[PDB]
RNA sequence: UUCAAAGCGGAGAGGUA
């Protein structure tokens, strides 16, 4: 995915709050590079198969987390957000950003009663 | 949306009579006279 | 010029129409045309807003 | 001729209508 849809944000104290997609991409790339290196040296096959199984599990966790096997947890014991979690929920893209949005030239305040007004009139501060 | 003279209601006026009067005004006079009649009734009741 | 008179005129425009959604488009077209044709730097009765002017003109045309 | 330095994501708890 393009890098502005998974950006890096800086907290107040100078610490970074990176997304959850960057971790999953990093895991996939690291396992892929390690497996390619092992295949280059002509390693024993019983270890190459372990690497292949781990790579399958990594790509599966990137596509959808906790569907087939075990959920991948991050810093805390909370699950990471995969690609399917972006679109699927009630707080996903469809119901939160496309079927209703925030707008400009808008305000909000408390209401009181106004007599001596005509219907079709309102009082704006 | 005119020409229909109101009847002199010589009786007590609860909520049902007010709803009936508003309906009659809409049916006979239009949608801009009902607002005026409702505003006048609101002023009289508040007073 | 009063707001009540404008309300009555708009109600009269809604009737004699045969379609509620077709009169709003005509009023909008007339208002846009009037505001655009106002570009001549003479300021012909610029006090009135274009939509109210369109409503008044279309009501007058109704005879 | 150039703009420009103030905006950021998530989790938990409570409240008003």
UniProtKB/Swiss-Prot annotation, chain A:
Keyword check for 4Fe-4S: no
GO annotations of cellular component type: DNA-directed RNA polymerase complex
Alphabetical GO biological process terms: DNA-templated transcription
Keyword Transcription part of the UniProt annotation: yes
Keywords, alphabetical: DNA-directed RNA polymerase, Magnesium, Metal-binding, Nucleotidyltransferase, Transcription, Transferase, Zinc
GO molecular function, one term: zinc ion binding
Quaternary structure (record): In cyanobacteria the RNAP catalytic core is composed of 2 alpha, 1 beta, 1 beta', 1 gamma and 1 omega subunit. When a sigma factor is associated with the core the holoenzyme is formed, which can initiate transcription.
Function field: DNA-dependent RNA polymerase catalyzes the transcription of DNA into RNA using the four ribonucleoside triphosphates as substrates.
Protein name: DNA-directed RNA polymerase subunit gamma
Species the sequence originates in: Synechococcus elongatus (strain ATCC 33912 / PCC 7942 / FACHB-805) (Anacystis nidulans R2)
Lineage: Bacteria, Bacillati, Cyanobacteriota, Cyanophyceae, Synechococcales
Residues of the full protein shown: 251 to 375 of 624
UniProtKB/Swiss-Prot annotation, chain B:
The family this protein is said to belong to: Belongs to the RNA polymerase beta' chain family. RpoC2 subfamily.
Self-association and partners: In cyanobacteria the RNAP catalytic core is composed of 2 alpha, 1 beta, 1 beta', 1 gamma and 1 omega subunit. When a sigma factor is associated with the core the holoenzyme is formed, which can initiate transcription.
Function: DNA-dependent RNA polymerase catalyzes the transcription of DNA into RNA using the four ribonucleoside triphosphates as substrates.
Annotated protein name in UniProt: DNA-directed RNA polymerase subunit beta'
Organism: Synechococcus elongatus (strain ATCC 33912 / PCC 7942 / FACHB-805)
Name of the gene encoding the protein in the UniProt record: rpoC2
UniProtKB/Swiss-Prot annotation, chain C:
EC number(s) given by UniProt: 2.7.7.6
BP GO annotations: DNA-templated transcription
First-tier enzyme category under EC: transferase
Molecular-function GO terms, alphabetical: DNA binding; DNA-directed RNA polymerase activity
Alphabetical UniProt keywords: DNA-directed RNA polymerase, Nucleotidyltransferase, Transcription, Transferase
Key word Transcription present: yes
Domain of life of the native organism: Bacteria
GO CC annotations, alphabetized: DNA-directed RNA polymerase complex
Catalytic activity of the protein: RNA(n) + a ribonucleoside 5'-triphosphate = RNA(n+1) + diphosphate
Family designation: Belongs to the RNA polymerase subunit omega family.
Assembly description: In cyanobacteria the RNAP catalytic core is composed of 2 alpha, 1 beta, 1 beta', 1 gamma and 1 omega subunit. When a sigma factor is associated with the core the holoenzyme is formed, which can initiate transcription.
Biological role: Promotes RNA polymerase assembly. Latches the N- and C-terminal regions of the beta' subunit thereby facilitating its interaction with the beta and alpha subunits.
Name this protein carries in UniProt: DNA-directed RNA polymerase subunit omega
């Amino acid at each position: 995915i393009p890098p502005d849809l998974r950006p890096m944000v800086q907290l107040d104290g100078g610490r970074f709050a990176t997304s959850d997609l960057n971790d999953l991409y990093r895991r996939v790339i690291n396992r892929n590079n390690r497996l390619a290196r092992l295949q280059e040296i002509l390693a024993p096959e019983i270890i190459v198969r372990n690497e292949k199984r781990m790579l399958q599990e990594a790509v599966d966790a990137l596509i959808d987390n906790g569907r087939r096997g075990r959920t991948v947890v991050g810093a805390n014991n909370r699950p990471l957000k995969s690609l399917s979690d972006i679109i699927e929920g009630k707080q996903g893209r469809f119901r939160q950003n496309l079927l209703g949005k925030r707008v400009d030239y808008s305000g909000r305040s408390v209401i009181v009663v106004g007599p001596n007004l005509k219907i079709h009139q309102c009082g704006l501060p | 949306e005119a020409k229909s003279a109101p009847i002199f209601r010589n009786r007590v006026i609860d909520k049902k009579q007010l709803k009936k009067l508003i309906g009659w005004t809409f049916a006979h006079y239009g949608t801009a006279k009902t607002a005026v009649v409702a505003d006048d009734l609101k002023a009289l009741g508040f007073r | 010029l009063d707001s009540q008179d404008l309300l009555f005129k708009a109600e009269s425009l809604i009737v004699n129409s045969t379609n509620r959604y077709h009169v709003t488009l005509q009023i909008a077209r007339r208002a846009k045309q009037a505001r655009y044709e106002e570009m001549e730097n003479l300021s012909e009765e610029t006090g009135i807003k274009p939509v109210l002017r369109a409503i008044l003109e279309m009501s007058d045309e109704l005879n």
